[PDB]
Design a protein around this ligand. Structure first.
Ligand SMILES: CCCCCCCCCCCCCCCCCCCC
Ligand SMILES: CCCCCCCCCCCCCCCCCCCC
Ligand SMILES: CCCCCCCCCCCCCCCCCCCC
Ligand SMILES: [Fe+3]
Ligand SMILES: [Fe+3]
Ligand SMILES: [Fe+3]
Ligand SMILES: [Fe+3]
Ligand SMILES: [Fe+3]
Ligand SMILES: [Fe+3]
Lengths: 164, 164, 164, 164, 164, 164
């Protein structure tokens, strides 16, 4: 029997599908970077897409551990184009902050229901979101300091393509 | 400049999106098996989902090698339930046969345009599809021999749960 | 369900039985060389017989992978005698070319029916036939220069007796 | 010079061709098991086919050691179908006992001619047939206890698929 | 005896000489880059000249395997100068695309004659040409982003100078 | 600034193209040996062809080290046919002696101009030419002792096929 409420279960299932879209969105940024010839930036986004799937699977396993079930929903078409290298990463940061707020909303719902298990489970994502936002802010800061010089952009592309 | 025709490029980009859905469909079959308590079958479907992602990324790589660009499209909601273990694998089998026919159509399109590079590239998927269909047929054959006998179904769940 | 046509399955099953006969034929050439006291040439033919069996088993595996069945047929009695070492290899070259043409006919039949899986599967045998015909031609050209000189035939016997 | 009588050489050459058919017969039993979806039992028959070929090559080497030569004959078409797993292995047992009696006849013929070299050479096959018959009797005994229970047949198939 | 047609042998022999000229052409671009003081770009072209030689030897090997012989023809004088780094690599891309079409013509010729051995042999060059064109397009894209900036050109020179 | 005179650079550039032809000539001798079925002699000529390319690149390096630039010229069609194995190697010897005399002429030209750097650089080729002429003379002496006997020629083919 399910020991999370249907409201909490649906909130968690909604976030799983949101994590799937985040994966799809980052792959779409890879299609943009590859079209612009930045295979290092595209590589960074492909690795980011795979990491987002592990976030989705962590929601997946917790839902079943609490006696629930996952229902996959349609994935909306992501944007394919951005007005430059820095514009894409600014869209990534805005998305991650949106995901952080979505995690907050589940946390507050679970907290009002005294669902301490789900509240505690979400702590990992709260801390992880802090790191996800910082990693994009650092990249954005280096892109701003580059100020469009292919000199620096070439090294940052080579550097981000180095991601394991 | 793109050296594949827009017709061939659209056919390849469509197949990439079909591979993305195939991954999603097998993830949804994993949600079904996990809901039914068969963590070995669910594990098998999760591994199949990741293998379909590598199929999509192969189309991804080739499109850019020929000067094209990938555009990710919306992903339809897959079915979430099946009328049994054998009904799911039968849906998996006919999905894969449909995928083989879709690859066949690109090959014939590429062949009529004398796009030998794409014809040769598609050979790996033709051979791979032979194995994809065969492994599902083997599971269906073992499930039919099982005839819904839990002691045998337990062994196949453990067996498929060992997939690397 | 069989996903190859009955016409193609019979063509593939016929070639399996042809590969079995070729295996048998090379063993019979070994019986001739051993009768003549050339254990190096006989060793080469015994290894060639084993190699043809792996060709037959490759057809075996593909037929079942496509949902078909193998039916073994009677094997004709091969010749037991040849008019010397060079006459045997002249029969071997003529035989390999016959096998190559038999592979060609299956390839063209599968191609007419748009059976791309079988067309792709046969590519391995096409390339292998290039090597097998070349190996016999190399031996025949070296035998032609030998002109029956026993000092050269011994070293070639010792050399071919070293086959892995 | 040949130091075995032509009567003995013919008996040994006939047995060689019998071993070739034995290999072919067990390969045909593999085609039946593979058609029925028991790839473990089919694996057992494919390995058994290889072992019969080593029996043929043992007769091969001895015939030439005694100054004789081998003449390969046509191979009869083996049966392609059996009415069940127990029917196939029971046909295997009766074939092996028929092979044992044929070896007995050579031993008695050779001993009446006081061909002690051939009598002693056949000792290895006499002992080997004891093991060949016993291994089939053991499988038949396990099949009789299984009485068609798929849970038992499944891992008996897996066990015989482990044959080295 | 030659088992490829004279029409196909000449087509293959013509392509071998084409590969020889391409080898010579890339060596000539190295003389240009070295004259301009770019030892990294020159190093890249010297490695490319050697890779083209292995292409020629592959055609060499196959022609003799099919019973033909190679006849070396005169090599035209390649251009010695170019209007810039990007002019050379754009001439390299145009040449490689011309080489691919020459491979396409041989494949279509061989297929019209049902020379399946040559059609299958040429698949390797079809796939290789995809990579040859892709790597030059990548360099052209990096040169376009450099836009003549010596700070960026210095990085691309050292990068291409690291080619093994 | 170029520190060799234009007359010395032209003499060096002419020898570079001469070395390129020497490589091409030995590859042509390989096509003849392969056409005659002597894969050992052909292997020797293929290795010799690769060695001549390193001679050309040595001239390539020295010309640029002295501030000059290389201009590649057209390569004449080499001969494809010889009367026999001993003609090919006798043509190789007289070609190498011609190369030695051409190096002598550059040496005397450079010494007339008191270009001590080029004179000392050429010493390596003077000593190397002694070895190249010697190794061909040894092969010619063994072929003369063979006197067209195929049993001895086969041993020399195998031996020269071992060249590293
Ligand atoms: C090497 C580059 C890899 C890029 C991967 C991009 C993945 C995008 C996925 C979008 C959503 C489609 C459904 C994915 C299901 C994944 C299931 C994983 C189970 C372990
Ligand atoms: C050196 C031995 C050559 C033997 C040639 C025999 C020709 C006729 C053989 C008929 C039966 C062949 C059975 C082959 C079974 C192979 C099983 C392989 C399993 C991986
Ligand atoms: C490192 C620079 C190399 C430049 C090569 C330019 C070649 C131009 C044509 C001259 C003839 C080349 C013959 C090559 C024969 C190679 C044989 C290899 C056998 C494995
Ligand atoms: Fe996330
Ligand atoms: Fe797929
Ligand atoms: Fe064959
Ligand atoms: Fe036996
Ligand atoms: Fe090439
Ligand atoms: Fe030289």
């Amino acid at each position: 029997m399910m020991v999370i409420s249907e409201k909490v279960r649906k909130a968690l299932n909604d976030q799983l599908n949101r994590e799937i879209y985040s994966s799809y969105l980052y792959l779409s940024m890879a299609t943009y970077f590859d079209a612009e010839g930045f295979k290092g930036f595209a590589h960074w986004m492909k690795k980011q897409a795979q990491e987002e799937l592990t976030h989705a699977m962590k929601f997946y396993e917790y839902i079943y551990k609490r006696g629930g079930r996952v229902e996959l929903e349609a994935i909306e078409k992501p944007p394919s184009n951005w007005n430059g290298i820095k514009d894409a990463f600014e869209a990534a940061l805005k998305h991650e902050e949106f995901v952080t707020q979505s995690i907050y909303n589940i946390l507050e719902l679970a907290s009002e229901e005294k669902d301490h298990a789900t509240v505690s489970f979400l702590k990992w994502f709260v801390d992880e979101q802090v790191e996800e936002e910082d990693q994009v802010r650092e990249i954005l800061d280096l892109l701003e300091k580059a100020n469009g010089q292919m000199s620096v952009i070439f090294q940052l592309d080579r550097y981000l393509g180095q991601r394991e």
